[PDB]
Amino acid sequence: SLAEKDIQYQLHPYTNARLHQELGPLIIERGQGIYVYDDQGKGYIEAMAGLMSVALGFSNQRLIKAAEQQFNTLPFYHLLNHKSHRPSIELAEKLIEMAPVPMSKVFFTNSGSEANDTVVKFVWYLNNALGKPAKKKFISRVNGYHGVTVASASLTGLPGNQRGFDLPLPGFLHVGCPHHYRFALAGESEEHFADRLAVELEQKILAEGPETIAAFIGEPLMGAGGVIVPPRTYWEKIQKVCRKYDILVIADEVICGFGRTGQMFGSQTFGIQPDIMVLSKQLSSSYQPIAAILINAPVFEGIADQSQALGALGHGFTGSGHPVATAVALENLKIIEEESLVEHAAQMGQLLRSGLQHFIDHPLVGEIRGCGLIAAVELVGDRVSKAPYQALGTLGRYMAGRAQEHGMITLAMGDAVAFCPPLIVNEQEVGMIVERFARALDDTTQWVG
Template sequence: MNAINDKQTLSTRDIQALDSAHFLHPFTDFKDLAARGARVITRGEGIYVWDSEGDKMLDAMSGLWCVNVGYGRKELADAAYQQMMTLPFYNSFFQTTNVPAVKLAARLAALAPKVGERSFEHVFYSSSGSESNDSNVRMVRRYWDLLGQPRRKVIIGRMNAYHGSTMAGASLGGMTGMHAQGDLPIPNITHIEQPYFFEKGLPGETADEFGFRAARWLEEKILAVGPERVAAFIGEPVQGAGGVIIPPATYWPEIQRIVDKYGILLISDEVICAFGRVGHWFAYEKFGYKPDLVTFAKGVTSGYIPLGGVMVGNRVAEVLIEKGGEFNHGYTYSGHPVACAVALANLDLMEREQLPQRVKGELGAYFARRYAELNEHPLVGLAETCGFMAGLVLVKNKQTRERFGSDATLVGMVCRGHCFRNGLIMRAVDDRMIIAPPLVMTTSDIDEMMRLIRLALDLTHKDLKEKGLL
């Protein structure tokens, strides 16, 4: 296609052709996408987005777990514009700083719940969750070096967890498809099983009993590696990209007991779960544990502009500051003034509209009640929520909980297709269907979302019967 200018009006096919010719998408089969053509999203308002053909879709995934305040919030656009006209960029190297970055760091420190020696007074900025988790690896290993324990390099993660797609982030995560490309994980990163009761629970075992057993897989791994070599454990409060895997209530307190017993650091990856998603500013408060480092991104700006970082607990920060000298790590956009200004406006908006409190209170309870009704559907083995995150398992036999086995991915994509064709964005993770809707939803929005989900399930049930999969 010939060169274009920004004033040309392009058809959907024109945009798709340019997309195929020039844009390599993340987590995409490039050849397959070129054959089918990408869906072109052109605008958003509230909880809805529209594509280039004029189709309206309820975005039950908040973009990618991030548009917490919904689309079209003028306050955030104004904050970006004002900061761009004042100071669009300056770096944080060479003993310089900027006002929005300082204000945001202080604001985040004030929002983070206090947990004794693991209180949070310091922030290390990045532009994404992936970069933030790379920073965690650097800080954790530097911490132990400074304490005279350089053998403590091993970081333990979980299978089916997602911590980003950089070399370190993908290694910390436990997704085998990612590890199969690029010789991952990198050295000194290992994994334990995920706390997925529906799949891993034993006959007759309660969820609480399973929670204790799943947490103790960490202790077994620490002993296998050698406690003197283990630096940290990293986990998402609720596993997001893995399918909204919600751990039993006993899991995180037992994890806390184990990391305390062996003196290792605890990293809470809250890229998805922070900023109201589970009804708290930070999810570790909900689940009752005390991390040393908290990864954040996504909801800090509601996805309006890239920003990420690490909340660094006092236990770690004091060692890095008092004993560390120069920390040879950072990014061009660490503390970007425009991103930080948008984050401040986003937090103002969330506080003014009490979005975390609404998710924790009556609105979240209403969502949980409505979503639980899906447990009655013949295709659903389990439907569960945590704040404004939810997942359900598609099963072949509801009574026996028989799964679809090798057809799991196909079944999930059939359901996803019915969602999209009927104006709903819902994500498929094999046989799990997941959502993370905007926090600005009303009860009537929830009712409409549930109507669309049930419609998609009904159509999927009919489709699978016709395909002979039920």
């Protein structure tokens, strides 16, 4: 059977390999709209849009035709040694012109992980170029997600991404997760929470030596780490501290990018003025692996100078700007703009968040959080103590399993279940997502008993 071949031959990411050898896979055969189907023909709402990525859903014919047209023209070429091609150029133009702050240049990669890894190298290269060889350290946040390379997983602030991998590397620093529900002191306002986080950052910088700190990287809101909306005034006050010590602000838009948070970019939603932006996922609705780094004039000018001094920029991937990946992403962004999906997603997000808010007084519901068309419901064993049932993750695992039984694919992030549907979700589809959440919660409530 296909399931036995999978057990025999594939090591799965983010999977217990031994449990996999026992249970085998859930094989997804096909998709259309917001739905995927297993090999038994059971349909599921992809409430996660795959990996917070499939913006236009699973059967957008314009993307499929854009791939075909590029395949039949030039199915592969590269950008090395002055070589170029139309889809990379037209995508780079569109990305610079739609950027929420003035940007200079695009550098393409296959993945968000490769992109953040590349940003680390580019910042090191830049500060070497500027004669600041000590200005190399990165500050990220607890529960931040920035990818899985040796360097990008050091940026990542999830313990499950570091345990057993001897990470983080030296020079990769973490300050606090900006999650009021978990980290605010008794009675502390959002603004006062934001103050204390800005202080933590300033004190980390002073303790490490400001001359040693190159960059601060953050997702506008934290996706994979639990759909963590920062408190009011966090980004304003954090940026003041960064500008104070000449620290680059990197906006990781891998999940927030292209209409997830109620505006085109999380940088717009949260008032971020980044030096560097990292884009992926909704860039192509994940129909092709592609990510993009936007760098502003000063970062480009320094890198360009050093690329001349050292002969050439000694960096690039075979797939960097792949013509099929760039052609699909270009068409994807045109569809998001032509179909006004940023504003449609904002409207569907209000319906999603209002539907979930009906459960705010459920005895297992600790917090309902969200922004735009991304949300999470964090379950707890006790609302007063905020303590888990048995152990962190026990409720989330059971909930995600029940959701699947009820025909919905969600992702458990500890004891939070996430919602990140395709931007094309309609009103009754949002209603069905909340209904399947409600069934899963009912089952979880009877289970905890």
